[PDB]
């Protein structure tokens, strides 16, 4: 709803790239650009300060510069642990401010997901509410859609998806997208489908059931 | 060794107060300027604030200005974040950050330096639920999990067979239902054949709330 700060723009690499993030400062004279990277669950970490200094314990592959008004970061070699979130910083007018987020994330081919669709468990329609659950499991790239159909009718607004993070050896990705309705509302619907589309499938793969087998 | 270690955060409710402290170990923080940049979760950073005790000056983003307060205190080298009238968007993780003092006046800035782990600050009007555990039914290989719900607040660490099932496991991170209660998965992807014989429990931990469950699966009739 209200969102503080964007989320992280993704760019998709290999590992032996030459990446360079570029971030726009109006305020040049505030050369004073630093650059960090953030990996899931951790702090971030300093790389490049005063727009083109090495920090020191940062391998020498990132490098920074400036053209005029452009702060540019770029890494030569992209190595497996490089594949992370980068931040640019800047300060202006004392105060200091963060890009919005750049996620390398590693490249490979396209893979479709593996549907399943999970029932609720007769402890939860006992507690009054009915939760049908959708998996996607080791899928690339992270974009995919999951459409849920009751009764052959369209749903919108009664789900969650929940994507987790790239998998370091397989570099795929899993959804589960939650269906939660009431117990009222599941006991009058027969067919609950999961339509999934994804880049690697040629057509919608659906993965249905009928309440009670 | 410079190590900056955060505290205080935890559930507060919307319009209530909440004070961090950000105690740190290695060097001075007198001459030095100590900072407050948050996360939310699954977005970027954002600084909120900057202190200097030489100085005294305090400067704040302008997204917490007139609430938030920043401080330190050099008899314990710690500094603080005081938060009132916190509202939900300022659910976040709270990492203190330090900024070398100014040495040179051309290179006056040189990148926040070392950080802290960060401390999280769930604001919100809900109360410390337990976790309630449901198994997923399982219908080559064939997929099946615990649907673990209605819990307040973040986080819960999801185990199978005792810590002992680990590769397959996909354990995705919590949604924040419109109850105001967090609701996640946990799936895993285990041979059929070993359906029957070897026994599926996951261990859900909640630690805020003391809940250790452990709910078996089993395919249904």
């Known amino acids: 709803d209200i969102q503080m700060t964007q989320s992280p723009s993704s760019l998709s690499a290999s590992v032996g790239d030459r990446v360079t993030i570029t971030c726009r400062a109006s305020?040049?004279?505030?050369?004073?650009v630093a650059w960090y990277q953030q990996k899931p669950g951790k702090a971030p970490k300093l790389l490049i300060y005063?727009?083109?200094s090495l920090y020191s314990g940062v391998p020498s592959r990132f490098s920074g510069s400036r053209s005029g008004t452009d702060f540019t970061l770029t890494i030569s070699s992209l190595q497996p642990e490089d594949f992370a979130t980068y931040y640019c910083?800047?300060?202006?007018?004392?105060?200091?401010?963060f890009g919005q987020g750049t996620k390398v994330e590693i490249k490979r081919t396209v893979a479709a997901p593996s549907v399943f669709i999970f029932p609720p468990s007769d402890e939860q329609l006992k507690s009054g509410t009915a939760s049908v659950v959708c998996l996607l499991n080791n899928f690339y790239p992270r974009e995919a859609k999951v459409q849920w159909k009751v009764d052959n009718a369209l749903q919108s607004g009664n789900s969650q998806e929940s994507v987790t993070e790239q998998d370091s050896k397989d570099s795929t990705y899993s959804l589960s997208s939650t269906l939660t309705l009431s117990k009222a509302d599941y006991e009058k619907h027969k067919v609950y489908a999961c339509e999934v589309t994804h880049q690697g499938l040629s057509s919608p793969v659906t993965k249905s059931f009928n309440r009670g087998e | 060794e410079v190590q900056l270690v955060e505290s205080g955060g935890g559930l507060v409710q919307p319009g209530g107060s909440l004070r961090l402290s950000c105690a740190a170990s290695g060097f001075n923080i007198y001459y030095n300027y100590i900072h407050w940049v948050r996360q939310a979760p699954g977005k970027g950073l954002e600084w909120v604030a900057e202190?200097?005790?030489?100085?005294?000056?305090?400067y704040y983003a302008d997204s917490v200005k007139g609430r938030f307060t920043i401080s330190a205190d050099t008899s314990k080298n710690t500094a603080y974040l005081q938060m009132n009238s916190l509202r939900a968007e300022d659910t976040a993780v709270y990492y203190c950050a330090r900024s070398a003092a100014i040495v040179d006046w051309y290179d006056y800035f040189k990148g926040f330096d070392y950080w802290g782990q960060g401390t999280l600050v769930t604001v919100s009007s809900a109360s410390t639920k337990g976790p309630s555990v449901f198994p997923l039914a399982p219908s080559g290989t064939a997929a099946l999990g615990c649907l673990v719900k209605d819990y307040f607040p973040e986080p819960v660490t999801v185990s199978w067979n005792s810590g002992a099932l680990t590769s397959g496991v996909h354990t995705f991170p919590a949604v924040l239902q419109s109850s105001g209660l967090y609701s996640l998965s946990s799936v895993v992807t285990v041979p059929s054949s070993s359906l029957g014989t070897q026994t599926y429990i996951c261990n859900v931990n909640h630690k805020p709330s003391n809940t250790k469950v452990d709910k078996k699966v089993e395919p249904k009739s």
């Open positions: 202190f200097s005790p030489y100085s005294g000056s305090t």
């Open positions: 910083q800047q300060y202006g007018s004392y105060l200091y401010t």
């Open positions: 305020q040049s004279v505030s050369s004073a």
């Open positions: 005063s727009a083109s």
